[PDB]
Amino acid sequence: RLRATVSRPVSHQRMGTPMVENDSGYKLGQRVRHAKFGEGTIVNMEGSGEHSRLQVAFQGQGIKWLVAAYARLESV
Structure with missing residues (x-):
């Protein structure tokens, strides 16, 4: 129906x-998946809520900072 x-x-996350x-x-130790950076493991995080930033260890690059609210990672 258009x-x-x-x-x-x-997927709208x-x-x-x-x-x-x-x-x-x-949560730390969780495996994430994103078409932008690949798949990674959340090794660290900062704060909580919208202003929470996740330090994700992408096995195809390295540890990056993803603002949880705009990060919207899919669990592997």
Whole structure:
């Protein structure tokens, strides 16, 4: 029915998605997946909530800082 969704092949992830057992903050040791940086392991994090930044060790590059609210990582 010509729905106005994203034309980018990406699952719309955000704080408030109808995901069963959705996180309220990423946990350390979790494996993440992102088409921008690849897959990584969250080794550290800063703060909590929207201003939370995650230090993700991407095995294809290195540790990066991802602002949790805008990061929106998918769990492997």
